[model samples]
Target: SIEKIWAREILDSRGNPTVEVDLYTAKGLFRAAVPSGASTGIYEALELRDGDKQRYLGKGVLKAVDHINSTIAPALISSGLSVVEQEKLDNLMLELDGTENKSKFGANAILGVSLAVCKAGAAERELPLYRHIAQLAGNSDLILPVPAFNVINGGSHAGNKLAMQEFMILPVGAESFRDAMRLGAEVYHTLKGVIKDKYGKDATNVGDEGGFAPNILENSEALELVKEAIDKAGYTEKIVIGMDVAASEFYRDGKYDLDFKSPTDPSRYITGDQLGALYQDFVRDYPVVSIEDPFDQDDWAAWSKFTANVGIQIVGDDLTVTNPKRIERAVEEKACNCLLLKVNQIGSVTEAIQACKLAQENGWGVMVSHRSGETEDTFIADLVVGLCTGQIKTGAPCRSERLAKYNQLMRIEEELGDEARFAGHNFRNPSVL
Candidate 1:
């Protein structure tokens, strides 16, 4: 049982305020922090912020913090539900909110508490957080996820001209999570050198996700840079590339404007079919294995058409938003081949697991992800291994917030020792064995 609950406001990686919670049980105290996003999906759960322009440019989460302290915390404490009853507690909060998208008390409040409670439950059960999460999902096999390092940032994540939000490197050839980190670090360093040589030393400066934000407009230029880095690092055969187009950021009047950064550029906008062809060209020319949000969120026809024609993984981040209903619709439509699971998108661990289960049941891969605005929480590290998602994308190997997760995963691998299993080449779908 939880003894006390406390919520506070803390700064995320972006220097923006977010919610953090601490829950005390008989065993001990457990704490967790919530993450935020800049290029957020339109249909995601509400993140509740104080609307006053006077406070932190209206990005303050004091309202969310208040909701947790004055309402959610008291109600949850009085409910008498053990921390282990994750589903019930989550549902109770859902009921209390009584909204479609968790707007009443703010998803940030609910999620912070949910994460804290989950950790407390794990403590009470005398298990690691990952093992407890696995038990919650009814998953037996523990698999270390292949880390997808975001090496280049653009769109909403950077002050650049590229429309894509992220360009990632996945070291699928590594033998274990530890080896994968080494490979990623090597490639990232090589990529930095390549960028500095091509675009000058200033281009090596990173974005919000610790990825270099080169001032290039063409998406192909970013891809070419990554490919060159892989070749220079002599890991072309071992490393693969992935992109998060975040097409919604440039979606305009049934077309995608690759140059959305510039105003009055309607002529530069391209149709969905044209974008699809460009992706095909990239796949043929580079080691591209995954494309995320290649089309706008509501562009179902484009998504289905692209998935039908493309053989590589097409991930649904904005389309699914880590919601079961959305995942069900996308599965039925054959819209995308994989699900990009963001915990705060749907707002609870139980619901997140449900979404993952729905995706896996339909033979879709799951990529546990981190947002642009993050914290030193490291909860998603346990989540990826626990759910056996086989894939994780936090950020580049730099930045303390991003490295916190990678460092935790390395510790987990050290702890598991001989039992540890890296997802490796089968990142999209790792076997239970």
Candidate 2:
């Protein structure tokens, strides 16, 4: 049975904030724990960031210090556990939490804090954190290759009154493709009623070109509706239909692989030409306004070709981790016209700002993004407002987590006063880029 919970903040040798916790249960032994890194690379990089040092250090040192002050410091101070035992537990918890797996700096910090709490609790209980987690949560292992979907309103020019549903599946699986199409259809039918109620028959007609499918439908039922809307709206000069194939396909080893799942195995990686063929085929059928990640992220030549041939905005996400240095390199190679911004990837409020600034200065459209393993953190909401990026991609805008982002964006628009503007009304607006 659980008794009491206590928390402490400590500073590391480098002066970064680290947190620890102690849980006293019916059992007399009190467990203590601290957070550390799984691998040296992440730990070293973390120490390099000067701003985070002081705060994290405060958390780290304070964990043991505070625990003693609150509980053990008063009584039973001479438990047999040595200082080495405490450090061992801390390191063990860090390894278990897999902090080293994180490639980005910001994600590391967040995970570090959570791991610290787990360690401290285990220490107080006199058990391994992993063992405790397994007993408590019934799982000793963590899941990976989490599913993520990217729903893009694709077109060169915005306000086309046609919604292009581009579904991006990570860790590609057949199930993801199937589910996305099913959800897409549901969204279409649901939004139809919404438009009808909000703006009457005229507005309902705006959705005639919208429909759903498993993949790029050979016979797109919705494309005709979009074409009709384009013709009726007389915005042919402005409105365009397109797909962002950024994660749709990838290239590897001098060949283009059309299959999304190929990336998981290097042996089956796709080549650039194969991806180009798919893009060519799509453009042949639709007046595509953009094709993103038509080739692997690193393939600047293929990216340039797709943009030149398709004459559309080419966007990059996996190709560029929203890093300013990577974006600048892509610009030099004329990689793409757009950048996808994910704040948590870089892990600093300042770095995200710099990335957005670089994209804007270089004439690239910046899109705020949400990740697969997302929480209700509203930092990105403020980012969209502060940066004034006209576009954001946060999935289907249905799930609570995804919707939270959309809702936050709506609020930002309200807060920004006259300076704020919705990128496009309906799908056919020509200014969506």
Candidate 3:
């Protein structure tokens, strides 16, 4: 049973105001904090920001905090905490808000409280958050996810002029998360050295997600550096490159604008089909294993066409935004083969799990993810294991905010002992089941 719900304002890694909530039941107290995003999707749920420009630059979350204490608490606590009733409680918040995008109460506010509710309930039963979530997800065995390291950044994430965002190196060669981190760290250091040697001393400076967002014009140059880093780190076959083009940021009118051309040269824009064709070439030329948001969000036709052409892990981040209904629509049209699950995207842990459940039901993979403006909150870390999503994109191995998730997973892996099972080699080829 729920006894109390409280909320307060906190700062994210980006120094922006975010919501943090505490849910206290008879058994224990649990806390959850929401993360912000630098490159946000248009269709994602709205996180309310106060209009007071003087306070946190109009990003103050006072209204959201008040909503939890005044409205959500009274309505939620009486419903009690049953593992199966998690979704019901989340839906109550959605109902109370009665907004399609959760703009009424603020996704940030609602999500923090929702996560705390689950966490508090989990503690009551003396179950790990992962185990409790796995039970909520209707599963028993929790498989650790293979970490997706965002080693480089571009676009809005950094000072770099590069249009594409996030050049990652997933360690496919290392089956265990422990070994995977070693390979990732090695390649990361090697890449840092390469950037320094070629592009001056500060070229290796990190971005919002702890990726090296060097001031480079061409995206291919970043790819080459990653490839070089892999070989130089002597992990020729250990790691493979994956990227988040975040094409929605580059999409304009009916064309996709890219930074492959020289800085002084006129911007190069291509049609939806042309953009797909370009990614097809990238997959053919490089060991690119994953592509997120290769086209504009509403460009379903182009997304489907690209997936058909390139047989890589095509994930829907901006496209789905962790909305189960939209994910179902994408599955129906083959818009993507994987989902980038973000709890804040839908404003509730239950809803995010539903999105994961829906993706799995339709035979699509799920990548539990984090926002660029993340905090030390490791809720999603347990979420990946609890739901057995088997894949995570918590940013680079650098930055404490990003590492917090990995560190939590490391602790969980230790607790599970020999029973700990890493989602082995699934992304090696590439699903729901």
Q: Which candidate number would show the highest lDDT if scored against the true structure?
A: 1
The predicted structure with the larger TM-score, 1 or 3, is: 1
lDDT of 1 at 120: 90
Q: Best-fitting candidate, measured by TM-score?
A: 1
Per-residue lDDT value at 187 in model 1: 87
Candidate 3 on 1-433: residue-level lDDT in tens?
7878889998999989899988777776678899998789999999899989888779899999999999999888766656336788888899999989998999987898888888876886688989989989898777878899999889878887788888888887786888888888888988899999999877988999998877787778888888999999998777888788888887776787776323533356667877776677778877998899888899898898888876788999999999988898899889989999999888998888889888888878888889999988899889999888888889899999999999898899989999987775775213232
lDDT of each: 0.92, 0.43, 0.85
Cα error, residue 12 of model 2, in Å, equals 28
Q: Please give the RMSD to the true structure for each candidate, in Å.
A: 0.8, 16.8, 2.2
User: Cα RMSD (Å) between model 1 and the true structure?
Assistant: 0.8
Q: Is candidate 1 or candidate 3 better by lDDT?
A: 1
lDDT agreement of model 1 with the native: 0.92
After superposition, the stretches of candidate 1 with alpha carbons farther than 4 Å from their true spots are none
Model 1's TM-score against the true structure = 0.99
Q: Which residue ranges in model 2 land beyond 4 Å of their true spot?
A: 1-106, 110-165, 168-187, 190-242, 247-252, 260-271, 416-419, 425-433
Give the TM-scores of the predictions, in the order they appear: 0.99, 0.49, 0.95
Number of clashing residue pairs in every model? 0, 53, 0
Q: Give the alpha carbon lDDT tens digit for every residue of 104-145 in model 1.
A: 988998899989989998888889999999999998989999
